[PDB]
Amino acid sequence: PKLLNKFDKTIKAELDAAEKLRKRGKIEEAVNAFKELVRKYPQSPRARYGKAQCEDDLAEKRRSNEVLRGAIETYQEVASLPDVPADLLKLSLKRRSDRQQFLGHMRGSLLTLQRLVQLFPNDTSLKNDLGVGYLLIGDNDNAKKVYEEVLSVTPNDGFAKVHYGFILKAQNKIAESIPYLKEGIESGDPGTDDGRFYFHLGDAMQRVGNKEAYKWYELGHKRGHFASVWQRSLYNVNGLKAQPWWTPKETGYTELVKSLERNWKLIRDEGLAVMDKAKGLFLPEDENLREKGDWSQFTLWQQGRRNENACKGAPKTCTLLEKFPETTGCRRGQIKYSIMHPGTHVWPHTGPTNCRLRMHLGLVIPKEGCKIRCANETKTWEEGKVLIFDDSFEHEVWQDASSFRLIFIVDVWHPELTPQQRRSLPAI
């Protein structure tokens, strides 16, 4: 890349020297050396870029967000200076956007990428990176407009196809998403070999009846994305024991299980009381997992945080669960009531993480019509009995009874997770 303008060429020696100290690993000596060059040559783009890059490296060594915030500002200063080479301008602001996302300043990254796409209107890779910005903030409509433009200029961009297909699939355009996801993955372009697109292509195929879904599940497994054709979670810790169905003894959570089964009617009655007197606290499932039916959930704990208002509706149940941090502290699971009505079929799906196990306590179980498949075995609920499975495996649910089915869902940390992993793992 051409990063030295005319003036920077007259001082290339002084610049390469400081870059040497950085490449060697003496960051503190390089920040001071680029800082002195910026003092001496206030309009040098390469010297400003070097200071920002040394600040970037220093923040990593210290794990400092304050230092990284400084590098982000220095990266912008490179773009305010005069006669900045175009390769240097793009590198500086792309890194600004990238590191802006690591801190969680998504709106800042978006603004930086918008400026990049305006300064360089013909670089499709930047528009593609801007579409990711919109996806990370939850704006699927603006990400759609972007990838449509990319495909209208470069029709064979695989990165844009998979992302466009991902958007269409999230909009419930299952039939329309399959061609974009499949071609995008087959393109082999950079960024297309991602587990998310294998996951969503097979699911789309499974929904329209196409039996080729498992071939894509198999490919994702062979390419290291999925741990198995059945276990297709993507936010995983490797090494944890993996089986569809668990027994209470296998989990080691015998006290939690005994407590739920000994006191099950109490948990049932508080949930029925909310159904009768506070139905609005039951919220519909909003993840597009149903083919048909009514599925609603009343959530007491999520991401290890207690819903104060919900626990006022189920006060005794919440007091009971406080004694068991294996579930109340599961920052990758929930504790919730779940009601399903007749005529409901939940598509085959997996949960996001392998770091939890899911317990089902039966509360109101119709005698017929209710069944849950996990992997290749189908089981039924029983009132007052706990059922334990790993929802990271593909599971499917039917409700073809004559009345409603109420269960209590309790997520626990996977038993083989160390106490440290249980405190560090980001929440889901």
Binding site: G104, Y235, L289, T353, D391
Partner: peptide, 17 residues
């Protein structure tokens, strides 16, 4: 958020170091 499924482009949230 990713509760029962994996429908979001990202299920986690970045907060820096």
């Amino acid at each position: 958020k990713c509760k029962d499924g994996l429908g979001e482009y990202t299920c986690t949230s970045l907060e820096g170091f």
